[PDB]
């Protein structure tokens, strides 16, 4: 619904530490694991990175 509470402006998104930040340093939550805004990351076969909040995986 259209709820009531404490938000921050649309350019800013909520971070875990109470502050809210733009989507540049908004971490990724792949498989529960909290990855930093720039984390290149791969097993042998898969290839994944965190750009701006989303986790871009490939194969």
């Amino acid at each position: 619904a259209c709820l009531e509470g404490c938000f921050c402006p649309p350019g800013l998104y909520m971070d875990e530490r109470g502050d809210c930040v733009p989507k540049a340093q908004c971490p990724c939550y792949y498989d529960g694991e909290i990855f930093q805004p720039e984390d290149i990351f791969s097993d042998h076969h898969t290839m994944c990175y965190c750009e701006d909040g989303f986790m871009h995986c490939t194969m």
């Binding site: 530490r17 720039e38 984390d39 290149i40």
Partner: protein
């Protein structure tokens, strides 16, 4: 002996995605061993990776993690041999 902790830096700074924190997580690997034997070092600068404690907190070199958390006052009789 520092010579390996130097050898492990040059393999980390050239290999990882961001050599900023790879540097400052390798220098701490040495201070954390110097401190495990008795020697504390003051190696933090605005250039050499001083961490940003939030506005509520302040940086501190050698302190007591016993009278910090609010859970301590609820269970004071417990020992803190830290």
């Amino acid at each position: 002996s520092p010579l390996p902790y130097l050898r492990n830096c040059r393999y980390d700074v050239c290999s990882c995605s961001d050599g900023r924190e790879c540097l400052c997580g390798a220098l701490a690997s040495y201070a954390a061993a110097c401190a495990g034997r008795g020697v504390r070092v003051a190696w933090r600068e605005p250039g050499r990776c001083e961490l940003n404690c939030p506005k509520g907190q302040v940086y501190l070199q050698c302190g007591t993690p016993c009278n910090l958390t609010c859970r301590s006052l609820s269970y004071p009789d417990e020992e803190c041999n830290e």
